[PDB]
Scaffold this active site. Structure first.
Site, PDB file in Angstrom:
ATOM      1  CG  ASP B  92      -2.165   0.886   0.994  1.00 48.12           C
ATOM      2  OD1 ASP B  92      -2.252   1.560  -0.065  1.00 48.12           O
ATOM      3  OD2 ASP B  92      -3.028   0.925   1.898  1.00 48.12           O
ATOM      4  CB  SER B  93       0.399   4.288  -1.910  1.00 49.33           C
ATOM      5  OG  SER B  93      -0.920   4.593  -1.511  1.00 49.33           O
ATOM      6  N   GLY B  94       0.611   4.266   1.496  1.00 45.22           N
ATOM      7  CA  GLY B  94       0.749   5.080   2.688  1.00 45.22           C
ATOM      8  C   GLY B  94      -0.367   6.073   2.904  1.00 45.22           C
ATOM      9  N   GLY B  95      -1.198   6.323   1.888  1.00 42.69           N
ATOM     10  CA  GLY B  95      -2.218   7.353   2.012  1.00 42.69           C
ATOM     11  C   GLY B  95      -3.193   7.097   3.145  1.00 42.69           C
ATOM     12  CE1 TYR B  96      -8.523   3.820   5.734  1.00 42.63           C
ATOM     13  CE2 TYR B  96      -6.981   3.014   7.374  1.00 42.63           C
ATOM     14  CZ  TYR B  96      -8.271   3.289   6.980  1.00 42.63           C
ATOM     15  OH  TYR B  96      -9.318   3.025   7.835  1.00 42.63           O
ATOM     16  CG  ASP B 144      -5.110   6.697  -1.765  1.00 37.94           C
ATOM     17  OD1 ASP B 144      -4.067   6.381  -1.146  1.00 37.94           O
ATOM     18  OD2 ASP B 144      -6.208   6.173  -1.519  1.00 37.94           O
ATOM     19  CD  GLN B 191     -10.174   6.484  -2.150  1.00 33.98           C
ATOM     20  OE1 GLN B 191     -11.289   6.256  -1.668  1.00 33.98           O
ATOM     21  NE2 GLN B 191      -9.051   6.064  -1.574  1.00 33.98           N
ATOM     22  N   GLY B 218     -11.712   3.331   0.058  1.00 33.13           N
ATOM     23  CA  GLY B 218     -12.769   3.994   0.798  1.00 33.13           C
ATOM     24  C   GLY B 218     -13.840   3.110   1.396  1.00 33.13           C
ATOM     25  CG  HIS B 337      -7.426 -22.457  12.304  1.00 32.91           C
ATOM     26  ND1 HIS B 337      -7.911 -23.544  11.603  1.00 32.91           N
ATOM     27  CD2 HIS B 337      -8.479 -21.626  12.497  1.00 32.91           C
ATOM     28  CE1 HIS B 337      -9.212 -23.393  11.424  1.00 32.91           C
ATOM     29  NE2 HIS B 337      -9.576 -22.229  11.941  1.00 32.91           N
TER      30      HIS B 337
END
Ligand SMILES: CNc1nc2ccc(NC(=N)N)cc2[nH]1
Ligand SMILES: CNc1nc2ccc(NC(=N)N)cc2[nH]1
Ligand SMILES: [Cl-]
Ligand SMILES: [Cl-]
Ligand SMILES: [Zn+2]
Ligand SMILES: [Zn+2]
Lengths: 371, 371
Positions: B92-96, B144, B191, B218, B337
């Site tokens: 993931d790009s880091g935006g979140y 993003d 988005q 989103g 598991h």
């Protein structure tokens, strides 16, 4: 497959190497037993424990009787099935944790409150042996009365003498339980603290009763290595030569080497597991703390010679990151390496005794480990 | 071995099954990606992650840029070598996390303070792509701008439109880096929140730029399953049919099944790992909390059909004990598991689509899982 057969294949000075054959497997001696207090060697599957070279692990009567419970473990099929370790298990009798962890002592036994929830519980020679039967232990420890370090001569004698009476009661309870007497072994525990005469009285009493093996209690409790070695110097020769000698709670690598030089065949301690989780890795050049900034970009394995799967696959830099981040995989990898290092130490000890070069091994080991 | 080749082998309704071929391996779709935020899938060696059936794992630009650092990982040989996972990694790009974990936004990018130590850091489309290059990601996410749930129409539009401009900047930065463009793939992130017109505008902008795959951003941020499915109903058809569709952060087993019914090919979430450590085990009869007293003497495996190594070897009663005792092995076994259960779910989804019986599988799955 015999119930219990100790055979010494080779000697050098006071050091011995050989095997204990039991129904669930062979134990190569001198042996190191990883500690599995709560029915797990912390952070390792049992197959990983075996992959490091361990022949036997240690469980604990006191912890398992509180959680999950001895009768419960027996109902579920015994400790071996419960945790998935099918090889020998030695169980301590609970006497040490009654002192160290719980919070009324008499000749009959001891009542105490659990450190986990304050519920009241009872232990006695007969109850300890019964709990170890319910667990399905392969090596059962006699139930003893411990006294804190440093012990006065009076407290050392009093706890030792009661321990010897309790050793006879442990013997009788074990012998009365046919399945236990036919399939397990029973070890006595020599007490007497740092006092030679008490150690002698304790050894004499234990040998008169007769056990499959003899443990040295009352060490690894704060006395320092010089004092421990001094006590071993006179204490181990007092035990029957033809039976295994088990030094409880020891210890650091150098402690193990020196204890073998003094006639010890079996060892257990939490150091490799506990200090591994804390970031200490054992190497042939001495311990390192992997959290230190000097390892942040070190691509070498934890130890340059170690054959373990961790050292084949991951760098110091990665394990440094894991431990500093509090990641479970850091605990897993440090523990596997440390237990494998301990097993490789025991293997080098066994091979050097068998080859008549253990003196040189010990000298070479110390010169490099403390350089 | 191709850089990136998505092939759909079979369809049923909106559902698809097939493969993404990449230089480091094949990804079977629909796919579930275990999350490995700090360069580890928590409590699992990478070989164990692979043994569960995972084809690809997820890493995170934001976490790794803070600890241990992107340039440091590159100096050490890249993320694959560092953590010992040689198969594809999506980052993931880091935006979140800039939104969710850190604590100044502009058209250029974002400056923020780290949640770990308050040090200041910068992210931008160009810097995110560069960090993912330093990590050696196989699937790179466009950078993003996220907005918290629930987003107003104004905030949803504003963050979406900037995200589309940043998607073009991400495309150009990726294409300028020859080694990245030749060996990795780049996914855009749609988005627009719950608003159909914004989702359409976002899809149109992403398709005009052109990506190897299209993620739906989103969602899995608190909206509930009915609303998420409603958004997927109109959002997924807007994306190019011939490229993979990645639903970020989803989700529970039933969320995954319904999202596949709506055209999603790829999934990630922390639920199986995080909730496993907390005591929740997934079964075909719904989740159970292994800490519940009803499991204290249950000798059955976590799930009666599961093929994983945990269910072959240990009982509910043992894992109940481990988790209640806070033992690391409990986290290890629950996580293995749960990740294996998720992979078996994906395998059943893939097989049922290929065989033209996915509708019946989904019905049978729900009837039993929610019984
Ligand atoms: C941690 N040190 C340490 N020394 C020990 C000696 C004896 C015992 N147990 C026993 N006498 N039943 C446990 C020990 N633990
Ligand atoms: C935990 N839920 C959850 N939903 C997500 C959607 C998007 C993203 N990342 C992104 N837009 N770069 C992460 C997510 N995490
Ligand atoms: Cl430990
Ligand atoms: Cl997680
Ligand atoms: Zn090693
Ligand atoms: Zn399973």
């Amino acid at each position: 497959r015999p119930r219990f057969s100790f055979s010494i294949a080779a000697r050098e000075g006071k050091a011995r190497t050989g095997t204990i054959e039991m129904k669930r497997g062979v134990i190569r001696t001198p042996a190191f037993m990883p500690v599995g207090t709560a029915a797990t060697v912390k952070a390792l599957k049992p197959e990983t424990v075996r992959a490091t070279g361990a022949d036997i692990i240690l469980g604990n009567t006191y912890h398992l009787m509180l959680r999950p419970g001895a009768e419960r473990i027996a109902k579920l099929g015994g400790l071996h099935s419960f945790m998935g370790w099918d090889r020998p298990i030695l169980t301590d009798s609970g006497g040490y944790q009654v002192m160290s962890l719980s919070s009324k002592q008499s000749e009959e036994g001891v009542t105490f409150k659990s450190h986990l929830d304050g519920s009241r519980h009872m232990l006695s020679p007969e109850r300890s042996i019964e709990i170890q039967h319910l667990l399905g232990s392969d090596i059962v420890m006699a139930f003893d009365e411990c006294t804190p370090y440093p012990a006065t001569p009076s407290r050392a004698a009093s706890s030792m003498e009661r321990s010897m009476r309790w050793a006879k009661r442990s013997r009788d309870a074990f012998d009365s339980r046919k399945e236990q007497a036919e399939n397990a072994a029973l070890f006595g525990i020599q007490q007497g603290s740092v006092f030679e005469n008490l150690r002698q009285q304790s050894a004499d009493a234990l040998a008169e009763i007769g056990f499959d093996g003899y443990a040295v209690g009352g060490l690894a409790v704060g006395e320092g290595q010089d004092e421990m070695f001094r006590v071993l110097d006179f204490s181990v020769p007092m035990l029957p030569d033809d039976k295994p000698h088990y030094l409880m709670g020891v210890g650091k690598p150098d402690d193990i080497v020196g204890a073998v030089e003094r006639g010890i065949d079996m060892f257990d301690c939490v150091l490799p597991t506990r200090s591994g989780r804390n970031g200490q890795a054992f190497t042939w050049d001495g311990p390192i703390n992997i959290r230190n900034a000097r390892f942040s970009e070190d691509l070498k394995p934890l130890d340059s010679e170690c054959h373990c799967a961790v050292c084949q696959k991951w760098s110091r830099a990665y394990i440094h990151h894991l431990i500093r981040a509090g990641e479970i995989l850091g605990a897993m990898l440090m523990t596997e390496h440390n237990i494998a290092f301990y097993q490789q130490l025991m293997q080098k000890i066994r091979d050097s005794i068998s080859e008549g070069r253990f003196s040189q091994f010990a000298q070479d080991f110390r010169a490099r480990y403390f350089a």
